[PDB]
């Protein structure tokens, strides 16, 4: 369905072959394509957004509609900030793939599932370490 | 099989002043706000209708 | 993380250096594990309660 992360590219879910080793050339190419497409789309979306912001901005004589026109922009800019934060994550994932150190948990050497990588291709940890880290995070944050 | 309670009626979300504006469901919150604020300032005319 | 082989009844439940996962916990509970050998150095780290 044209709504996921595999949809953005014209790629279909992979299929690990019976005696296929984990990280082979084809899988690495696959994931590189995925990440590059994801990035380029996000950058083009930012370009759209900026053009919209540049076109709309005007000086309104009513204080209760300047807020109206500056309350959708705040949300838009929020989304753009979040995606800007994710572009650095994608760049780092492209560095791990280019360095051929992609597909394993950063905490413990266990390899991260292929289906998990097709779910969230930027995954850095295994589900267990991810959950434990998320707990430590929410506890140090809240 | 889990709902313990339920809203008494739809109108309980808003005050009387805002409750008087018809078709609130289609109005942006800001304009509802000003509507109620100014509506409370209306002056009685000679003949109420 | 295990600092020694976690084992009982002649069975190594967790190899030295492995992070203990939910699966490990389920296996220990399933096997009614209630007593494990530990080295003195592991306890020397600890704070006495009384
Ligand atoms: N659009 C989009 N953004 C993503 C996605 N994944 C991660 N991000 C953003 O990247 C930022 C970095 O996330 P991380 O700190 O690495 O947390 P994570 O491991 O769960 O990804 C996050 O900012 P954040 O401040 O933690 O978000 P929030 O706390 O403001 O909600 C998040 O908003 C994604 O799939 N899509
Ligand atoms: Zn891990």
Swiss-Prot record, chain A:
Q: Keywords assigned by UniProt?
A: Coiled coil, Cytoplasm, Metal-binding, Zinc, Zinc-finger
In its keyword annotation, does this UniProt entry include Protein biosynthesis? no
Q: What happens when the gene is disrupted?
A: Deletion blocks induction of rpoS by ppGpp, but does not alter relA expression, ppGpp regulation or RNA control during the stringent response. Increased expression of ectopic dksA, 2-fold decreased expression of CsrA, 10-fold decreased expression of sRNAs CsrB and CsrC.
> Where is the protein situated, by its record's location annotation?
Cytoplasm
Coiled-coil segments on the chain, per record: 24-45
Known consequence of changing residue 65 to N? Does not increase ppGpp-dependent inhibition of transcription, but retains its ability to bind to RNAP. Increased transcription of its own RNA
Protein induction: Expression levels are constant during exponential and stationary phase (at protein level). Negatively regulates its own transcription, translationally activated by CsrA.
Instruction: Describe, by residue range, where the zinc fingers (dksA C4-type) fall in the chain.
Output: 105-129
Q: Which residues bind Zn(2+)?
A: 105, 108, 126, 129
Q: Which SUPFAM superfamilies match?
A: DnaK suppressor protein DksA, alpha-hairpin domain (SSF109635), Glucocorticoid receptor-like (DNA-binding domain) (SSF57716)
Keyword Lipoprotein set for record: no
Set out the biological process GO terms recorded for this chain's protein: double-strand break repair; regulation of DNA-templated transcription
Predominant location category: cytoplasm
Listed GO MF terms: guanosine tetraphosphate binding; zinc ion binding
Instruction: Return the similarity comment.
Output: Belongs to the DksA family.
Q: What PANTHER family would the database entry show?
A: RNA POLYMERASE-BINDING TRANSCRIPTION FACTOR DKSA, RNA POLYMERASE-BINDING TRANSCRIPTION FACTOR DKSA-RELATED
Additional observations: Dosage-dependent suppressor of a dnaK deletion mutation. It suppressed not only the temperature-sensitive growth but also the filamentous phenotype of the dnaK deletion strain, while the defect of lambda growth is not suppressed.
Q: How does it assemble?
A: Interacts directly with the RNA polymerase.
Q: What is the official name of this protein in its record?
A: RNA polymerase-binding transcription factor DksA
Specify the species.
Escherichia coli (strain K12)
The organism's lineage is:
Bacteria, Pseudomonadati, Pseudomonadota, Gammaproteobacteria, Enterobacterales
Gene designation per UniProt: dksA
Swiss-Prot record, chain C:
Q: What does the entry report about post-translational modification of this chain?
A: Acetylated on several lysine residues in the presence of glucose.
| Industrial and biotechnological uses noted in the record | Co-administration of salinamide and rifampicin or salinamide and myxopyronin suppresses the emergence of resistance to both antibiotics.
SUBUNIT field:
The RNAP catalytic core consists of 2 alpha, 1 beta, 1 beta' and 1 omega subunit. When a sigma factor is associated with the core the holoenzyme is formed, which can initiate transcription. The rRNA transcription and antitermination complex (rrnTAC) consists of RNAP, NusA, NusB, NusE (rpsJ), NusG, SubB, ribosomal protein S4, DNA and precursor rRNA; S4 is more flexible than other subunits. In pull-down experiments interacts with CedA.
Function (record text)? DNA-dependent RNA polymerase (RNAP) catalyzes the transcription of DNA into RNA using the four ribonucleoside triphosphates as substrates. Resistance to the antibiotics salinamide A, salinamide B, rifampicin, streptolydigin, CBR703, myxopyronin, and lipiarmycin can result from mutations in this protein.
What protein family is recorded? Answer: Belongs to the RNA polymerase beta chain family.
- The protein's name: DNA-directed RNA polymerase subunit beta
Q: Which organism is it from?
A: Escherichia coli (strain K12)
> What is the gene called?
rpoB
